[PDB]
Amino acid sequence: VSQPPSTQSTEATSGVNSQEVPALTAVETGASGQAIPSDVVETRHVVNYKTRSESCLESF
Amino acid sequence: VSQPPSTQSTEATSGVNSQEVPALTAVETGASGQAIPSDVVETRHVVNYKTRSESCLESFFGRAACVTILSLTNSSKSGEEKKHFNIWNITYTDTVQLRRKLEFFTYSRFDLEMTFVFTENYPSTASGEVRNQVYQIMYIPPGAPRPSSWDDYTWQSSSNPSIFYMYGNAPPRMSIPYVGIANAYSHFYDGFARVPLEGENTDAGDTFYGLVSINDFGVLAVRAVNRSNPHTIHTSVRVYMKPKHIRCWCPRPPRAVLYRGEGVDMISSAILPLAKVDSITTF
Amino acid sequence: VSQPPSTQSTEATSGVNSQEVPALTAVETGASGQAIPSDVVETRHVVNYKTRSESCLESFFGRAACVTILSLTNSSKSGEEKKHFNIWNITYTDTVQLRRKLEFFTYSRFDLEMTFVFTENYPSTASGEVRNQVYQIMYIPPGAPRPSSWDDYTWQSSSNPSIFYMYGNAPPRMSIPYVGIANAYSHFYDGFARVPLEGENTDAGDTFYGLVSINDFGVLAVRAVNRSNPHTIHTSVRVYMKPKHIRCWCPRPPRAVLYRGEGVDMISSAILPLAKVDSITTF
Amino acid sequence: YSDRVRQITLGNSTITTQEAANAIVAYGEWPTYINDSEANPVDAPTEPDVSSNRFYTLESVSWKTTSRGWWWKLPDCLKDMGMFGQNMYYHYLGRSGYTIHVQCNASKFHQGALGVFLIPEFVMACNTESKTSYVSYINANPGERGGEFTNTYNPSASEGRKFAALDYLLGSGVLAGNAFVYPHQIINLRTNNSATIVVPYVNSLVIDCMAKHNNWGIVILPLAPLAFAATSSPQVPITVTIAPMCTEFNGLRNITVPVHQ
Amino acid sequence: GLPTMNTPGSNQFLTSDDFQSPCALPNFDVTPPIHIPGEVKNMMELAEIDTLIPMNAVDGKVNTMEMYQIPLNDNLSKAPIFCLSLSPASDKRLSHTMLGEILNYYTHWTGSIRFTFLFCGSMMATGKLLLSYSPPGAKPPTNRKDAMLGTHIIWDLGLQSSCSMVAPWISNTVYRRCARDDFTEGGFITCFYQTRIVVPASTPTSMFMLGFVSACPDFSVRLLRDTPHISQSK
Amino acid sequence: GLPTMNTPGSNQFLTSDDFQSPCALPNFDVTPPIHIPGEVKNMMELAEIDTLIPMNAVDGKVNTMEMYQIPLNDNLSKAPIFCLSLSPASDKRLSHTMLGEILNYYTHWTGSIRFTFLFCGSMMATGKLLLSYSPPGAKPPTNRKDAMLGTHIIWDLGLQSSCSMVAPWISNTVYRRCARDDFTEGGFITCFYQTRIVVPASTPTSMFMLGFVSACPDFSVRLLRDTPHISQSKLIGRT
Amino acid sequence: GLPTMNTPGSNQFLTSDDFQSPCALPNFDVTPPIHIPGEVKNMMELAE
Amino acid sequence: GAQVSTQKTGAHENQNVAANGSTINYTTINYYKDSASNSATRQDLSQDPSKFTEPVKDLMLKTAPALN
Amino acid sequence: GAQVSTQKTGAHENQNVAANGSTINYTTINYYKDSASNSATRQDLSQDPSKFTEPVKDLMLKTAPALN
Amino acid sequence: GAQVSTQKTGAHENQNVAANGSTINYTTINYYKDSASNSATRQDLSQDPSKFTEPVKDLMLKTAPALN
Ligand SMILES: CCCCCCCCCCCCCC(=O)O
Ligand SMILES: CCCCCCCCCCCCCC(=O)O
């Protein structure tokens, strides 16, 4: 008996003044963008207990 | 294995002439008086093995109440094809007894059991042989397409859950897990669905107030599944609900008067809930 | 292995010329004779493997008796609308065989199994096609609201337990836990519900003497749930009861004569329970 | 160190009462901030503690011998406050607990009593006989100026789109005598000059939009009639002062400006 | 196939049934719980809250706020201030208090009941009131002497305010029926002046007191029933 | 033999039933599996793929390829270039994207949504675009000053042609309805020029941007429902 | 789920039937017993 | 948690000792929450006939004269 | 994976002890994947009336003047 | 050969851990010879979005310039 895998949690963050910026990318590459809220704005720690069970193909 | 907790047992006591007497207190503060019989009179020891099982919220709300009565008609008349199809909003407000019990709490979380009971008759002045009827109960979550007719394409139920019942078998039943988008269902919503802004008239928001405009739990669509017969059949479907696995918060007084609609609106002809007594000194 | 204890075996004995004579006793003492065959006659040694099972109180009261016959009528005639439902006082006094067995004891404690049997016919001289009928059995405990009609709001049953039975399915059934107020049900009440106190009526108590005045177990409310049809359906409902897990106290003789009402009243026309014998010397 | 004397300091303001009933904490729970384990919004919250958690005095009302009662929507009455008020308009979401202090002084020769009740979700009936929940935003949310209770219900739609409330049924069909199930305290002019009730944020949600929903309302009723020996018309003020507690807000937008009149 | 035999009770619907049933929405993800203040686990937690008694139901005060106001006066009286039948479920004035409304969903009840009273008059006025409960089956306590024979306390008005009289659980039965049967009668509750309330100069002479009722924590209820208080159009 | 009782629900058919059933073909030999590239285990794996949104669904471009092209001028303008309602199933332009479509089979949803914008102008064209998201319960932004108060990112056009903004899950609720609703308001997404696009001589002065939409990793859906994007005529057998 | 077969004797009401049944009044607190003298366990004690 | 107990003997030469055979046992499983739902109780042949046939303050021996 | 728990006391089930042998127990097996499909949960008699009857910050005791 | 597993959480349930108590377990027994006759499979909840969202031969890190 164990907890099922959850969707992505949010790490708390702060403003970033580095030059390595994940919000700037290319799609020419065939890849999707990878940014999440913690990459763009200041975020809080959020514990995410939500589970993608309804969306499993067996459920669909 | 152990004995469940009982209500308070009275301990034997005796007369008291102390300076600390519970009978005299104050209720200016929000507390209730705390006195029990042993504080007022001499009492005997009483062993109390009685409990409060029936007043547990799980027991209080442990019955399946009727919620609504829907009606379908199986008819060959073209003017009645529309009657093979009946869509009801999901609600608990159609029947007053269940509503008052739920109205005791401001918020709640529960799973819901739904049971349906079917009954039928000929509404006509003449009857004759008709094949056994099958009924389909389909849930259409808000945002899902509604059928335009008893025999439309949405009844194929590719995603919408639905149940098929043959009249005469045991009344159909299913469990619905808690479905609120909130962490609890609200029984009250002291607010508006949207905020009318400066660039709006001053009557703005008049129809957006209350639980009524905020909640939408979809609809239940019920139809005859048989094709029409020469002898009309009227079907009455009773819908029952039983909250289970229930927790509640923030108690409220129950309503003393008759309800007008789904909100808390009062009836001007029925705001007099109490009986008269001939005098204050009449027992 | 809890081998059931048998009734006594008979010890073999010889005749004696002893001064100890168990056959000569007194009953003035308020006790039965104690003699058994081994005390009075020469006897054989008999091993006794027989037991008293059918006589255990649990077995004696182990069958479901018909208690009452209720009736319903489903008809389109307006004068019959009131006949769609039947309100029955909960009681066992409608049936004599059961009262007589229960009245062997002054007090009893038991759980109760209730079973119902439905039967139906057309009371008319002209039958026709009618849909399967469904019945609702609702328990309305003391002080709970009564329906004014077969289709009244009280049939919502949000707390009152109820059974929905489709005709032809297995006879409906349910258990009732002991619900007495006292620690046992009494079958007798030698008293009045209240003491008349200088009430200016020397006949006071005439309307509130006996067991009836102290018993209110609510009513059983039974209705057809179907709407009216062109062909009337008459339904008989039989209520059966089986006390279970039963203990009793303070035995008394059974009634020898016909009952007149719910109390112990006699009809003067039937106070002669014994047959005549031509002579005391007739075998 | 008498129980009747109480001092509460929040932010940069203080309330001192020489005579008060023991303060009440609704449901036994002190106001808190949202724990990470229950957070709904993802963005970093703002917690303007000193600026927000400052007692704000509301315009007082007069208690007359004919008064039936007064009421407020709680976060709404504070929308006219500088800080906190602006935060409700700048942030979509917010949470706030409150310290509610009600004062009404009188000499020993006065009688009467005010029950103060805090009603979670104080939903009220409309004054229209043909429509349900028919109340305009503006009439429903009067701001600092509170509403009043009446003796009789007279439905009718300029008066229709307004709340109306009987005092005896508390505006919703519930007898006032059971108002006591709600967190409450009583100001008895005889023994108690003031009441203090502290409430946690209460909702089905951890945080909500304060421009749309009022999670608490304040109900004050003259449970015992006001009276005085030689005027037959004593006029004693009632002052209500409230501070937010443990507040926080989420999201950020061009300031929202509601429909007003 | 495993041989089986359906017993009576098959294919029936009981509103009190407690059986398992298939989920209409398999694998549904239930919104996580949060802590919410004010959790209630048992209705008796609400029965124990002191709520106001609509003691005054005289013509002109029925269904008005004044129903909760019991008059007191400086003038001398030997009369009962008030009289109440102890029937929390069926009495006209008690059935609608919170204790009453919860209780009206039950068929039977036990335990003691607390009656709490508070004086809202001037600080300047003093006096003593007799709060009394007499068990049933005897002449109603229509005067002070009978009030003294029953269970009673004296409420001495001063700095403190509220005074609680407790009607102990005295019954022959284990439980009392909610319905007002003769054999259910709870007894009589009265209040009398023990001494005249004295009002000093330039102090109002008409005074009011409030009364409240609540369950003591030895209180319980039995079977659940539909409450007779609510109705609706068909 | 074994005493039993039939409970409510007996002999019913529920389309969401999960019960065992006898096999019509006992001992049938099922073809051994092979690995096939591209296995999907969850619908959310598709929800997270950037989809091109038909944002410019304006008359004359609706249902043409041009609906996917957001026009941009070098000429200075203070107007928004585009605006969307962040309501995945009710905004008609958004509701037909793969994200919208997966969501059209669900009643309720959660999580942040990413918006990615690709500039397809000349290499010689430069400038800056402002992308922003404002939460609900507010005046929709009408100009850049309002855009600046909401959550925003400034995208410097340059070697990297694409950037993104994330509309974070800012909601009072845990879930929002997919279904159009007044309470579960989406919020607003807009774009304004931060500065004019500067274009040199003999270089296109009118260029396009392509917007894409996808789920973030914290995204979830909850109640399967029929999707009102698909219809059919009445079905009658053996005609 | 579990394959079953109804045997003769099914769906019948025997007045001497001794099977379990659901309770209409669940979680009921039964008035506790007290000692009452004169308890009878078997009808034969009266026959004697 | 099944309860196993013996059966009442039937016709097939069941020695009355009821300890003869392992096939004269049966199994009961209670399924419902309220015990009121249980089948009838186990047989109890314990009896106290003296309560009714010879209650007495001064115990009498049957072989003694009843009155002395 | 069955669970066993005590039945509620009936007319002749025991003393209120609910400790009168194994015959007063019952067995439940969950047959569904979804917890919402389970029968009603175990009765919880935990209670804490003070949340509503004595929600006071200054924790005064009963045998005391309320006002000092 | 019964399988015992964990149920999906309901309203009056344990915390979001979903691994607290025995009351959340349920039992499944397969009755038929073919596995095709079994009830639906257990949720996998396993995913690999990179198959469709970033199936790139070359390695890119999130904060890395996509092109260099
Ligand atoms: C196939 C039939 C499925 C039936 C689905 C019923 C949905 C129940 C919604 C929740 C009940 C209303 C809650 C509330 O208003 O507070
Ligand atoms: C769903 C219908 C439930 C019917 C319950 C009826 C109440 C039966 C009470 C027990 C019988 C009275 C006691 C006695 O026989 O002396």
Residue numbers in the entry:
A (entry chain m): 16 to 75
B (entry chain i), C (entry chain e): 16 to 298
D (entry chain j): 9 to 164, 168 to 272
E (entry chain k): 1 to 234
F (entry chain o): 1 to 239
G (entry chain g): 1 to 48
H (entry chain h), I (entry chain l), J (entry chain p): 2 to 69
Question: What does the publication say?
Answer:
Non-polio enteroviruses (NPEVs) from the family of Picornaviridae are nonenveloped viruses composed of (+) ssRNA genomes that infect humans and cause a variety of human diseases. For this proof-of-concept study, we selected CV-A21 viral strain responsible for a substantial proportion of enterovirus-associated acute respiratory tract infections in humans. Herein, we introduce an EMPEM pipeline for rapid structural analysis of pAb responses elicited by enteroviruses using whole viral particles. Using a combination of nsEM- and cryoEM-based polyclonal epitope mapping, we identified two primary immunogenic sites on the surface of CV-A21 located near the 3-fold and 5-fold axes.
Through iterative rounds of focused classification, we reconstructed maps featuring structurally distinct polyclonal antibodies bound to epitopes at near-atomic resolution (structurally distinct polyclonal antibody class—pAbC). We resolved two distinct polyclonal antibodies targeting Site-1 and three against Site-2. We next relaxed atomic models into the pAbC1-1, pAbC2-1, and pAbC2-3 cryoEMPEM maps. Given the polyclonal nature of bound antibodies and the inherent lack of sequence information, the variable Fab domains (Fv) were represented as poly-Alanine models. Specific epitope contacts and angle of approach were highly similar for Site-1 antibodies while Site-2 pAbs displayed greater diversity; consistent with nsEM analysis. Site-2 is particularly interesting because it is in immediate proximity to the receptor binding site (RBS) for CV-A21. While antibodies targeting Site-1 are distal from the RBS and it is unlikely that they would interfere with receptor binding as Fabs, antibodies against Site-2 sterically block ICAM-1 from accessing the RBS and may be able to suppress viral entry. Site-2 pAbs display high similarity in epitope and angle of approach to 1D5 mAb, and a partial overlap with 18A7 mAb that binds directly on top of the 5-fold symmetry axis. Importantly, all pAbs bind in a manner that does not block the accessibility to the symmetry-related neighboring binding site. While both Site-1 and Site-2 are highly immunogenic, the sequence conservation is relatively low, and elicited antibody responses are unlikely to cross-react with other strains of CV.
